[PDB]
Design a protein around this motif. Structure first.
Motif, PDB file in Angstrom:
ATOM      1  N   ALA A 165       5.262 -73.429  13.210  1.00 49.32           N
ATOM      2  CA  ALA A 165       6.409 -73.607  14.084  1.00 49.32           C
ATOM      3  C   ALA A 165       6.391 -72.697  15.303  1.00 49.32           C
ATOM      4  O   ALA A 165       7.268 -72.830  16.162  1.00 49.32           O
ATOM      5  CB  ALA A 165       7.710 -73.371  13.303  1.00 49.32           C
ATOM      6  N   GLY A 166       5.431 -71.784  15.403  1.00 49.89           N
ATOM      7  CA  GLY A 166       5.347 -70.884  16.531  1.00 49.89           C
ATOM      8  C   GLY A 166       5.937 -69.510  16.313  1.00 49.89           C
ATOM      9  O   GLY A 166       6.100 -68.767  17.288  1.00 49.89           O
ATOM     10  N   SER A 214       4.672 -66.740  14.888  1.00 50.54           N
ATOM     11  CA  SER A 214       3.745 -65.692  15.296  1.00 50.54           C
ATOM     12  C   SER A 214       3.523 -65.717  16.799  1.00 50.54           C
ATOM     13  O   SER A 214       3.464 -64.663  17.441  1.00 50.54           O
ATOM     14  CB  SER A 214       2.418 -65.849  14.554  1.00 50.54           C
ATOM     15  N   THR A 215       3.398 -66.911  17.380  1.00 52.69           N
ATOM     16  CA  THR A 215       3.232 -67.008  18.825  1.00 52.69           C
ATOM     17  C   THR A 215       4.450 -66.458  19.552  1.00 52.69           C
ATOM     18  O   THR A 215       4.317 -65.788  20.581  1.00 52.69           O
ATOM     19  CB  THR A 215       2.980 -68.458  19.232  1.00 52.69           C
ATOM     20  N   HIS A 229       9.656 -65.599   5.593  1.00 53.19           N
ATOM     21  CA  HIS A 229       9.818 -66.785   4.772  1.00 53.19           C
ATOM     22  C   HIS A 229      10.592 -66.525   3.492  1.00 53.19           C
ATOM     23  O   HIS A 229      11.052 -67.487   2.866  1.00 53.19           O
ATOM     24  CB  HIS A 229       8.448 -67.370   4.396  1.00 53.19           C
ATOM     25  N   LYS A 261       1.309 -83.012  11.655  1.00 52.21           N
ATOM     26  CA  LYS A 261      -0.138 -83.146  11.721  1.00 52.21           C
ATOM     27  C   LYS A 261      -0.585 -84.140  10.660  1.00 52.21           C
ATOM     28  O   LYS A 261       0.224 -84.678   9.898  1.00 52.21           O
ATOM     29  CB  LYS A 261      -0.846 -81.803  11.507  1.00 52.21           C
ATOM     30  N   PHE A 317      -2.890 -85.044  15.467  1.00 52.22           N
ATOM     31  CA  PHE A 317      -1.504 -84.990  15.887  1.00 52.22           C
ATOM     32  C   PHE A 317      -1.033 -86.389  16.283  1.00 52.22           C
ATOM     33  O   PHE A 317      -1.849 -87.275  16.542  1.00 52.22           O
ATOM     34  CB  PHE A 317      -1.354 -84.006  17.044  1.00 52.22           C
ATOM     35  N   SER A 345      -2.532 -72.419  11.344  1.00 53.42           N
ATOM     36  CA  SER A 345      -1.952 -71.107  11.116  1.00 53.42           C
ATOM     37  C   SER A 345      -2.457 -70.542   9.789  1.00 53.42           C
ATOM     38  O   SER A 345      -3.228 -71.176   9.063  1.00 53.42           O
ATOM     39  CB  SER A 345      -0.429 -71.184  11.145  1.00 53.42           C
ATOM     40  N   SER A 346      -2.016 -69.327   9.465  1.00 55.30           N
ATOM     41  CA  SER A 346      -2.462 -68.682   8.233  1.00 55.30           C
ATOM     42  C   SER A 346      -1.987 -69.447   7.003  1.00 55.30           C
ATOM     43  O   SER A 346      -2.761 -69.682   6.067  1.00 55.30           O
ATOM     44  CB  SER A 346      -1.964 -67.238   8.196  1.00 55.30           C
ATOM     45  N   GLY A 347      -0.716 -69.851   6.989  1.00 55.76           N
ATOM     46  CA  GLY A 347      -0.182 -70.521   5.815  1.00 55.76           C
ATOM     47  C   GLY A 347      -0.839 -71.860   5.548  1.00 55.76           C
ATOM     48  O   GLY A 347      -1.146 -72.194   4.401  1.00 55.76           O
TER      49      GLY A 347
HETATM   50  N1  LIG Z   1      -5.740 -73.801  19.945  1.00 56.88           N
HETATM   51  C1  LIG Z   1      -4.705 -73.477  19.166  1.00 56.88           C
HETATM   52  N2  LIG Z   1      -4.662 -72.236  18.631  1.00 56.88           N
HETATM   53  C2  LIG Z   1      -3.629 -71.908  17.850  1.00 56.88           C
HETATM   54  N3  LIG Z   1      -2.577 -72.649  17.497  1.00 56.88           N
HETATM   55  C3  LIG Z   1      -2.647 -73.872  18.041  1.00 56.88           C
HETATM   56  C4  LIG Z   1      -3.648 -74.354  18.864  1.00 56.88           C
HETATM   57  N4  LIG Z   1      -3.386 -75.664  19.238  1.00 56.88           N
HETATM   58  C5  LIG Z   1      -2.253 -75.937  18.640  1.00 56.88           C
HETATM   59  N5  LIG Z   1      -1.747 -74.900  17.899  1.00 56.88           N
HETATM   60  C6  LIG Z   1      -0.510 -74.893  17.126  1.00 56.88           C
HETATM   61  O1  LIG Z   1      -0.123 -73.550  16.914  1.00 56.88           O
HETATM   62  C7  LIG Z   1       0.403 -73.422  15.584  1.00 56.88           C
HETATM   63  C8  LIG Z   1       0.297 -71.985  15.145  1.00 56.88           C
HETATM   64  O2  LIG Z   1       1.598 -71.375  15.176  1.00 56.88           O
HETATM   65  P1  LIG Z   1       1.793 -69.937  14.571  1.00 56.88           P
HETATM   66  O3  LIG Z   1       2.961 -69.312  15.221  1.00 56.88           O
HETATM   67  O4  LIG Z   1       0.498 -69.130  14.686  1.00 56.88           O
HETATM   68  O5  LIG Z   1       2.040 -70.161  13.028  1.00 56.88           O
HETATM   69  P2  LIG Z   1       3.305 -69.535  12.323  1.00 56.88           P
HETATM   70  O6  LIG Z   1       4.521 -69.763  13.131  1.00 56.88           O
HETATM   71  O7  LIG Z   1       2.991 -68.054  12.106  1.00 56.88           O
HETATM   72  O8  LIG Z   1       3.470 -70.153  10.881  1.00 56.88           O
HETATM   73  P3  LIG Z   1       2.807 -69.458   9.658  1.00 56.88           P
HETATM   74  O9  LIG Z   1       3.904 -68.803   8.775  1.00 56.88           O
HETATM   75  O10 LIG Z   1       1.841 -68.346  10.154  1.00 56.88           O
HETATM   76  S1  LIG Z   1       1.806 -70.761   8.614  1.00 56.88           S
HETATM   77  C9  LIG Z   1      -0.425 -74.405  14.769  1.00 56.88           C
HETATM   78  O11 LIG Z   1       0.274 -74.813  13.598  1.00 56.88           O
HETATM   79  C10 LIG Z   1      -0.627 -75.567  15.748  1.00 56.88           C
HETATM   80  O12 LIG Z   1       0.370 -76.571  15.594  1.00 56.88           O
END
Ligand SMILES: Nc1ncnc2c1ncn2[C@@H]1O[C@H](COP(=O)(O)OP(=O)(O)OP(O)(O)=S)[C@@H](O)[C@H]1O
Ligand SMILES: Nc1ncnc2c1ncn2[C@@H]1O[C@H](COP(=O)(O)OP(=O)(O)OP(O)(O)=S)[C@@H](O)[C@H]1O
Lengths: 402, 306, 396
Positions: A35-36, A38-39, A382, C288, C307, C319-321
């Motif tokens: 969901a973004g 970490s980003t 979480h 996805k 997608f 992502s990690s999860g």
């Molecule tokens: N090139 C890319 N590199 C990284 N992420 C990408 C890329 N292209 C698309 N994404 C999207 O970025 C998301 C990663 O979001 P994150 O914020 O890293 O995960 P998250 O919010 O930490 O969720 P969890 O708890 O770690 S699984 C992926 O699930 C993709 O949908």
């Protein structure tokens, strides 16, 4: 003391938009996987820290960040003639523009011209008033790597984490146990010196009062306060007040208001000892609400030169902080990050539930906020236990896919 | 243990996005999962149990109904959570003829009560029990015992309701479990009678306290429609008593032909685990839903969920 | 094959003891901080793999591990002449004793002791079942890909002490490679069956030499399918056959229907494991879809995310999860190799929604292999409290 009021990311990874509005005290960000979260935390840390050169490693079309004061930072990444260009603009009309090629060249080399221009821009516009204490999700592995890092140096660990997890990862500034021990030692020294200064000043003033004067229950009160400030830690360098009270009583038994100043001298001193040691006492009490079979304590003795800060076991065996497990180390670090004895931060914690039982999870946030620091805390979690009792502070991020 | 707490569960409710059903125990979870899976084998519903939610208060440490009521009070309104609590003896009037004040499934803002005393009372249609005892029962004379049941159940449910009600009056829930035994029952021209043995683990005072109320009630419970009687019995005691009655029927059928086989069959089924009987009855009830008309189910709950 | 039934650890770290009994299908271990969870998983991983040389790095008094089959491995650390000895005694009556100094020297170097350990393991049938081990540190080691097992294990032992088991959980890169290999095997099996069906169909037609709606449906279904995208010339054949039949016996149509149904059935059977794993993974991922494409004219199958706009991305973008979900589901899938699955905190970076369906979806893949889990989350043990164990050391 600013705080983020809104982050509007657009076209992150060319696949999803995400607008988030923040509170000023606590923000528990939750959301489905991918969901973004970490980003979002990474963008926040990079904008707050002033590191605008890392946005050349993220693909996007806009990152608008609104601060509490009123400053709005707009970051674009436009492609002109097949060359990418990261442009940062503020609300007062000042902008900096640099090419992604130069940013990647500088990152590979490591103060290039781009780095100096960015640093001068940030310094002039005052974009580094508040730092960002970033607690990565991979805390345990990093802590095992190092020491087998500090809130200031934090350079080898950041490089390792960037090699492992891409080059947009915010610098790792979260305080390690070693820095916590050093900071506690320094705070104890400062408190000791302040107490000595207060003793000197109050001696002078009380002597002045006694000299000026020269031109029943008091004894009980004197004894009651003397016992308090005699058998208590923080005064081990001198614990003979009982003798002083005994001698005063003996002399009295063998003017009238003279003993009155004694109660004042002891009272004020005791109050000062509870204000000089206030921050350390609060932090240690917060930490000891979690640990069982061990308490974190500082010992003052005349033989030992350095006041010792470490764990106390019931048998009386001291030990350095390093003996604690992973969960205890995480508890200690986050509680310090939220403690008053920091400098300034927007504490960002990603997954505060790593290596913690539910008992500690439920009381974590409550105890972190128990110290009224006022630092803004953003927790991407979480675990339902971490957010118990704070359902009104929750933010759910649901990126709008394109 | 590592169970949740009430506040943690409310937080989980606001976090998660699935449709949830909160039941009082762990057996109801299995039965309702069977029902939901039958009506839609690909269902994303989760059934959680209050038994696996810890409560700090000592009073709540064992009262699951209070736990469900508390969680419902603190989370009233949310549209992805449904609650199912049992009816015990609420809204049941024992003035002469046993009467049901509310004749439908009570519903109050996502909280749903069971039609009878509990989920196990939906199983008390003659068809369901008769079908579901064959799948597990051996055959000393199977069909004969099935036929004898088919008739004896008419007064059997009245007697079982009387036993449950008497136990409720004397404030001793588990008394019917041990006091009554398969050799205890007596059959007379399709009429069930509960003779009183001599030795009993509980003090003879307890035996009297039960039997007096039982005798007082029986006329009261013999003057209402069998449906109300099936509704007013309790779950575990009802299942155990039905096991005992099928055992007694086995003995009555087999006594004439062979003593050894009849005794073996009766004493055997009298030991069959309660979980097995309940699972077989749940399978029969779910497999026999809608096709008949006297077989009930929590339709309102299923409509509210999904 | 086999499955641990009990573990009796004595004087581990000279601080506590433990005695745990394990079920046959799923074991969920929960406890307070400081309980011997990680040590227990490490001991079971080291005992199963036969890595007895690693017990020179643990301070214990007597360990006793008993499998379901009947073996009763018993490892004793003792002192003789002020020298530490690790004696490994089986229930068959055999025994091997090696010095701790030799083990430490060999591990520092990396030997006769290693060869003897291997000989004991192989002779007595001790490496029968491996043990996948999902450490608490999976994202850091997975990212430490810039044998995978050997280098990662060396790193993790330089960090977390030398008793750590060998880290052999299937990483996402290995998952992608294995999926591609299985795809290629399915394609080649399809080719072989196609040749055999061509021959047998010639035979069947000749034997005939001495419902059309259903065939329409089957041809339409088979034409539109990523599995059979190469030929894709099925609608044209059916239309031509219909036109010829109208212009102009039915036994030929019956043979054709049988042939098409047989090819569809074999196609479903060949991609069975891959399709099942992808379906299990897609029960989780939202927005996805893990998928594959055997088309492009570039002869290399594509396995990756899809997608909902036709945009493809590799697995490394997850992502990690999501990556951890992939890894654990594969470990529970029929494509995995080693029976025993030891997962330490499977609740890392996983939403409650996924934690609450993880164990159901891992037991639903009918592998029948033992799974041992150490979880701090109530959401993983929901619906499985009959299979839940609690370990409490008897601190001495
Ligand atoms: N090139 C890319 N590199 C990284 N992420 C990408 C890329 N292209 C698309 N994404 C999207 O970025 C998301 C990663 O979001 P994150 O914020 O890293 O995960 P998250 O919010 O930490 O969720 P969890 O708890 O770690 S699984 C992926 O699930 C993709 O949908
Ligand atoms: N080298 C060691 N020497 C002595 N005791 C140790 C050593 N390593 C671990 N322990 C202790 O052994 C016990 C079990 O190990 P742990 O890995 O800490 O289990 P655990 O703490 O429950 O795991 P979690 O999930 O990280 S809390 C704990 O009380 C540790 O402090």
């Amino acid at each position: 003391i600013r705080t983020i009021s809104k982050i509007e990311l657009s076209k992150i990874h060319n696949r999803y938009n995400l607008t988030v509005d923040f509170f000023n005290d606590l923000n528990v960000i939750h959301g489905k996987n991918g969901a973004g979260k970490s980003t979002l935390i990474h963008v926040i840390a990079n904008i707050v820290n002033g590191d605008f050169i890392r946005f050349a490693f993220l693909i996007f079309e806009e990152i608008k960040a609104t601060y509490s004061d009123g400053l709005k930072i707009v970051i674009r990444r436009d492609k002109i003639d097949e060359q990418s260009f990261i442009s940062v603009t503020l609300s007062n009309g000042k902008y900096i523009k640099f090419a992604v090629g130069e940013a990647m060249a500088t990152v590979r080399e490591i103060k290039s011209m781009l780095a100096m221009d960015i640093d001068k821009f940030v310094k002039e516009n005052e974009l580094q008033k508040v730092r960002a204490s970033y607690f990565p999700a991979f805390r345990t592995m990093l802590e095992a790597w190092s020491s087998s890092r500090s809130s200031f140096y934090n350079r080898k660990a950041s490089a390792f984490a960037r090699e492992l997890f891409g080059q947009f990862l915010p610098s790792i500034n979260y305080p390690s146990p070693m820095e916590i021990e050093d900071r506690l030692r320094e705070e104890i020294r400062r408190a000791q010196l302040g107490i000595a200064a207060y003793e000197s000043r109050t001696f002078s003033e009380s002597f002045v009062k006694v000299f000026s004067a020269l031109f029943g229950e008091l004894l009980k009160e004197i004894e009651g306060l003397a016992i308090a400030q005699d058998s208590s830690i923080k005064n081990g360098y001198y614990a003979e007040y009982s003798k002083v009270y005994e001698e005063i009583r003996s002399l009295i038994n063998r003017v009238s208001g003279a003993l009155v100043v004694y109660r004042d001298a002891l009272r004020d001193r005791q109050d000062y000892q509870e204000k000089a040691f206030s921050e350390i006492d609060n932090y240690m009490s917060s930490v000891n609400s979690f640990l069982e079979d061990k308490e974190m304590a500082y010992d003052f003795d005349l033989r030992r030169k350095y006041p010792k800060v470490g764990l106390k076991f019931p048998d009386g065996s001291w030990s350095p902080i390093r003996v604690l497990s992973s969960g205890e180390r995480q508890l200690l670090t986050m509680l310090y990050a939220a403690s008053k004895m920091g400098d300034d931060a927007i504490v960002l914690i990603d997954e505060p539930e790593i290596s913690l039982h539910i008992d500690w999870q439920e009381d974590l946030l409550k105890r972190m906020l128990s110290q009224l620091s006022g630092r803004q805390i953003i927790v991407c979690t979480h675990s339902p236990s971490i957010a118990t009792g704070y359902e009104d502070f929750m933010i759910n991020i649901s990126p709008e896919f394109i | 243990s590592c169970a949740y707490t009430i506040d943690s569960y409310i937080t989980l409710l606001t976090m998660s996005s699935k449709k949830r059903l909160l039941v009082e125990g762990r057996h109801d979870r299995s039965h309702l999962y069977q029902l939901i899976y039958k009506f839609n084998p690909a269902s994303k519903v989760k059934i959680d149990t209050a038994q696996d939610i810890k409560a700090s208060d000592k009073a709540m440490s064992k009262n699951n109904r209070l736990k469900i009521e508390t969680i419902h009070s603190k989370v009233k309104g949310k549209d992805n959570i449904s609650f199912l609590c049992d009816r015990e003896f609420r809204e049941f009037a024992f003035n002469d003829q046993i009467e049901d004040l509310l004749n439908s499934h009570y519903c109050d803002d996502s909280l749903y009560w069971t039609l009878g005393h509990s989920l196990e009372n939906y199983f008390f249609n003659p068809s369901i029990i008769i079908d579901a005892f064959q799948f597990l029962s051996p055959s000393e004379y199977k069909y004969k015992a099935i036929e004898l049941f088919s008739e004896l159940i008419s007064s059997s449910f009245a007697v079982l309701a009387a036993v449950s009600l008497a136990a409720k009056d004397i404030d001793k829930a588990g008394l019917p479990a041990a006091l009554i035994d398969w050799k205890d029952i007596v059959i007379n021209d399709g009429t069930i009678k509960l003779i009183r043995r001599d030795s009993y683990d509980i003090d003879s005072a307890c035996v009297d306290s039960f039997f007096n109320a039982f005798d007082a009630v029986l006329p009261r419970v013999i003057a209402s429609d069998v449906g109300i009687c099936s509704r007013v019995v309790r779950g575990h005691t009802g299942i155990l008593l039905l096991q005992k009655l099928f055992s007694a029927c086995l003995y009555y059928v087999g006594r004439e032909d062979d003593a050894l086989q009849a005794d073996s069959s009766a004493n055997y089924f009298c030991n069959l685990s309660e979980l097995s009987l309940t699972t077989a009855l749940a399978e029969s009830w779910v497999r026999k839903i809608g096709v008949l008309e006297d077989v009930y189910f929590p339709d309102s709950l299923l409509k509210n969920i999904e």
